[PDB]
């Protein structure tokens, strides 16, 4: 199945269990610039979506040159979770690989629901 390609449950593992050494495969649902530009990502593991992913600045060329885009599938290789002053937690993506382009995937996979943030 297409959702079988994703690391179902990885978002819960990051948020609830504090798993930091997993290398989950996730789908980009949306990329939003925020304000040197920074990018917030809505990401999916096939079961849940999380709105609080942020791209490390060193990864901005992946967005700028349009290889990281809505519907692409990527594997996260390094990330850090940080807590903001108001209690919101942000997952900062430091290293990732784009495994399949948006054009090669072509759709949002499955029907993930928002994780409780």
């Amino acid at each position: 199945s297409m959702v079988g390609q994703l690391s179902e449950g990885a978002i819960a593992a990051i948020m609830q269990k504090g798993d930091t050494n997993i290398k989950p495969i996730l789908q980009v649902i949306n990329i939003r610039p925020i304000t040197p530009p920074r990018y917030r990502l809505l990401m999916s593991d096939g079961l849940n979506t999380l709105s609080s992913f942020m791209l490390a600045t060193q990864l901005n060329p992946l967005v700028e040159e349009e290889q990281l885009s809505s519907n692409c599938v990527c594997q996260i290789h390094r990330f850090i979770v940080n807590t903001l002053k108001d209690g919101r937690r942000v997952v900062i993506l430091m290293e990732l690989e784009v495994l399949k382009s948006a054009e090669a995937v072509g759709v949002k996979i499955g029907n993930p629901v928002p994780y409780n943030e």
Binding site: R32, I34, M54, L84, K85, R88
Partner: peptide, 13 residues
């Protein structure tokens, strides 16, 4: 979803 004005200041670092 989007970050509040306060969050935006902290994320810059």
């Amino acid at each position: 979803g989007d970050f509040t004005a306060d969050d935006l200041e902290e994320l810059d670092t």
